[PDB]
Amino acid sequence: GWTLNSAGYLLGKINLKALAALAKKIL
Structure with a gap:
């Protein structure tokens, strides 16, 4: 890499x- x-x-x-996790938290 x-x-x-x-x-x-x-x-x-x-x-x-990971965004779905960051957007799920901020949400």
Whole structure:
């Protein structure tokens, strides 16, 4: 990891999952 390959599309397809947790908390 830690490369353009990561930011490629691994900074959303995941954060989107954790977001549901962050949006569930802030909610």
